[PDB]
């Protein structure tokens, strides 16, 4: 499948570093987004603590390490993630924000759609111990052709 | 407005450490205020502004027009800012904010997380994201157009 390139916003930040992970931990996540588009949950899921959670915030949340899994091996079943362009990563207080458009792909239609999303990670010890993801639903299930909710 | 499972127990994480931080959680109080022309002075003449489920506003005019036809739907509440961070002149704010539609008195705590630029103290770029069908299902009005 071709993907094309994700273009820049208009609000793309003037500050050159403000894509740029500027610590370990910014740099785990930079990491965790380029392995998103392998769609395999069992590689994602090294990336999490035994104690955390994944929610993408339109949908319930998932609680363990083996939930999230779950979760994220039934959205794979679903779609694929052909892409992830980060515009913006920073981090305060064991927190890391990251800005971006993830290209997201129903394998049940063949239709994609540019989702602009703001994510939230939390990390102890370098391993990912929260992971919210914010964006509208609706968008994404109208542009797919597919009722998640 | 419940303190979700998942926030920071550590209440540093809530608490600006920075002047655009600092500037960015004033701009938060100042939000129930529901006033445009007051909110407006917190923003630099190049600009923009964007809840992620509707059209941007570009330029300071374009922001003030948006804010404004905002407040005529809807009122801010409340507003509080569980995590706080920043890098590389970006503010970051994990939050829940209480809206009440107008129309209908009907009021919803949504969960938002949002990014501010800031150039000299000023707002330069400011993007909420949501999910806006939840909104409108709990307040029963059709925003989107």
Same mark, same amino acid.
């Given at each position: 499948?071709?993907?094309? +390139?994700?273009?820049?916003?208009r *609000?793309?930040?003037? $500050?050159?570093?403000?894509?740029?992970?500027?610590t370990?931990?910014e +740099?785990?996540?930079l990491? @965790?987004?380029?392995?998103?588009?392998?769609?395999?949950?069992?590689?994602?899921?090294? #990336?999490?603590?035994?104690?955390?959670? #994944?929610?993408?915030?339109?949908?319930?949340?998932? #609680? !363990?390490?083996?939930?999230?899994?779950?979760?994220?091996? %039934?959205f @794979?079943?679903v @779609?694929?993630? $052909?892409?992830?362009?980060? @515009?913006?990563? !920073?981090s305060?207080? %064991?927190?890391?924000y990251?800005?971006?458009?993830?290209v997201?792909?129903?394998?049940?239609?063949?239709?994609? #759609?540019?989702?602009?999303?703001? %994510?939230?990670?939390?990390l102890?010890? %370098?391993?990912?111990? !929260? *992971?919210?993801?914010?964006? $509208?639903?609706?968008?994404?299930?109208?542009?797919?052709?597919?009722?998640?909710?």
């Amino acid at each position: 499948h071709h993907t094309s +390139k994700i273009e820049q916003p208009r *609000w793309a930040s003037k $500050d050159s570093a403000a894509g740029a992970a500027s610590t370990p931990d910014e +740099k785990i996540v930079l990491e @965790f987004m380029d392995a998103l588009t392998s769609n395999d949950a069992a590689k994602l899921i090294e #990336y999490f603590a035994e104690d955390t959670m #994944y929610q993408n915030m339109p949908l319930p949340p998932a #609680y !363990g390490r083996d939930a999230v899994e779950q979760t994220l091996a %039934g959205f @794979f079943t679903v @779609f694929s993630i $052909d892409a992830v362009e980060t @515009f913006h990563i !920073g981090s305060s207080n %064991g927190l890391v924000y990251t800005e971006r458009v993830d290209v997201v792909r129903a394998l049940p239609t063949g239709k994609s #759609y540019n989702v602009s999303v703001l %994510g939230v990670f939390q990390l102890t010890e %370098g391993k990912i111990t !929260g *992971w919210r993801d914010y964006f $509208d639903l609706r968008e994404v299930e109208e542009a797919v052709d597919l009722p998640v909710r």
